[PDB]
Design a protein around this ligand. Structure first.
Ligand SMILES: [Ca+2]
Ligand SMILES: [Ca+2]
Ligand SMILES: [Ca+2]
Ligand SMILES: [Ca+2]
Ligand SMILES: [Ca+2]
Ligand SMILES: [Ca+2]
Lengths: 182, 181, 182, 182
């Protein structure tokens, strides 16, 4: 039983509850996370952070490994899905997922069209951990759903690309806090 | 590489698509923009702001410098054109442009009959930038299309003229948001 | 009877309902009407117009001569009462009233602490008319409630006094329109 | 003769009374202003903004140039001083004042330990103006208490520092409203 993940009201995060994922840095930290697109790619949508502090972005929900635990805890494999307020053009899912390696930038981006549940080698790319910190919570991609799978193991940092703040694997991660969509 | 401008749904503005330009401050802040007419001038039509914040006015289309970047980004020169929802009286374009100095008022008005494309000194007055504001976005007239040209460089704010709410160069820009039309 | 006063939705004004009194001019017009004070006078409060288009001010209610006529009509004597949202320190009323002559400005200002009802000589100064105009409605002080009373008879203009835009008797009135407060 | 500053009820700001200073843009725009401390400096306290738009922060009191005018008016030099809702660790004043240029950030910060009164070159850094914004009001550092002094002349915006939201000189001011502390 790992320590539960807490939101800005000090309440524990619950699976299936909507939360905005906002930058923990108060003062020049940017807003929350949302969806964007690329010049050469409308679908699936990529994960971006808002530049503006005013925009908390799009809420997410968290899915736990077992559907019978309803507490979000540190160091535990999670599915992350954007819950858009309105329907979207793309038919891809809005579930976070580590992309294939981008040879044009050398980065492993966070994109969508992941999958919910069914842990193991088929859904490996859709599993994320939340790790605690001094500044706040930081996302970590290091899935344990497949003990014999070779996997990347790294924090999720933030990195500009063609005018948008994207998420990608990095040595040091970007800190976030969680705000109820209430 | 510049930050994409975002509409009220959070989706990047696309060149060629129609958007309402609505005040980000509502209530007495007013509604969206529209073609108007001065009392003693039928053509060109002028740019005005609807008083009611329920009225989104009529949409515009944005045109980028390069016809290949389909995204509208901040701090880049673009053309603004109202969708011609108007009668057949005026042959003037519905493209925004900066007027000659108005000695009646001290103002550099935004009017229409601008020109799309052909960046350079001949069309200098038809190029606007969208910049981030404290909230939403503001327009800014500071063209970079002619480097040897001396030019005005200033935000667009709101000013009363002819019993209507018009746009003019101003120290502090007025903030707007963009709604899909 | 006389032509009914209309609000900004085209509906006729109804005595007993709340309307903002906003400047008819759109663009540089100022905001609505409200309560203010002077350096040497906290009470009663003076009638003022906001400089900012964003502020509609405080709603007024109108009272007809006879509690029967529910309609507010042009060229008829009315009481005008601010209905502030929160309670006010002043124990004076918020009913409009022509002031005593001001020997420092030469003006007959509109102030409050007026009285509702009782048409006649005692309440002469609390009766106003709304008149039609090209640019909108204008207020007129010219009461007909006391045949044997000598009275001023003048339009209500606006003058700037020590940072504030006040109302005072003037040759030509200032134009207003009426917005429902709901 | 200058237009009085108004609070959120429409009443003019009185010199000496207590007012919260709260961002006119709520949500991720933040709440009200407060005393803060940098990580490595206990005293003087700095000026920060509370992150929660429910948090009115700590009220201030305004001081005019002549203690005889009690109305706070736009575009006039005045002193800003937090109410000392603090511990007893600092001997420094809670009066706002513009800091020396900060070479590590390029910013002119608003800090405290300013001084009240005595307008002239000796107190030039402690005089702020309130100006109308597109909405509410912005602070503006452009003192005229010393005609011969070369001075900075600039709006007050917000900026990140030490993981906190600070006030600093900026091209476009940040808009605030004022709420009675009572
Ligand atoms: Ca195109
Ligand atoms: Ca204006
Ligand atoms: Ca220290
Ligand atoms: Ca005093
Ligand atoms: Ca002190
Ligand atoms: Ca304004």
């Amino acid at each position: 039983k790992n320590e539960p993940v807490l939101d800005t009201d000090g309440d524990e995060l619950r699976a299936g509850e909507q939360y905005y994922v906002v930058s923990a840095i108060w003062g020049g930290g940017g807003g929350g996370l949302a969806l964007g697109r690329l010049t050469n790619q409308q679908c699936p949508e990529i994960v971006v952070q808002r530049r503006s502090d005013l925009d908390n972005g799009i809420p997410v929900v968290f899915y736990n490994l077992d559907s019978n635990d309803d507490t979000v805890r540190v160091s535990t494999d999670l599915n992350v899905e954007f819950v858009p307020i309105r329907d979207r053009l793309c038919l891809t899912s809005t579930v976070w997922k580590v992309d294939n390696y981008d040879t044009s930038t050398g980065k492993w981006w966070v994109t969508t069209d992941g999958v919910i549940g069914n842990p193991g080698p088929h859904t490996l790319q859709s599993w994320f951990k939340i790790e605690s910190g001094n500044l706040g919570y930081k996302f970590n991609f290091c899935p344990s759903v497949c003990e014999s799978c070779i996997t990347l193991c790294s924090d999720i940092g933030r990195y500009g690309n063609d005018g948008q703040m994207r998420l990608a694997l990095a040595e040091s991660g970007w800190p976030f806090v969680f705000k109820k969509a209430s």
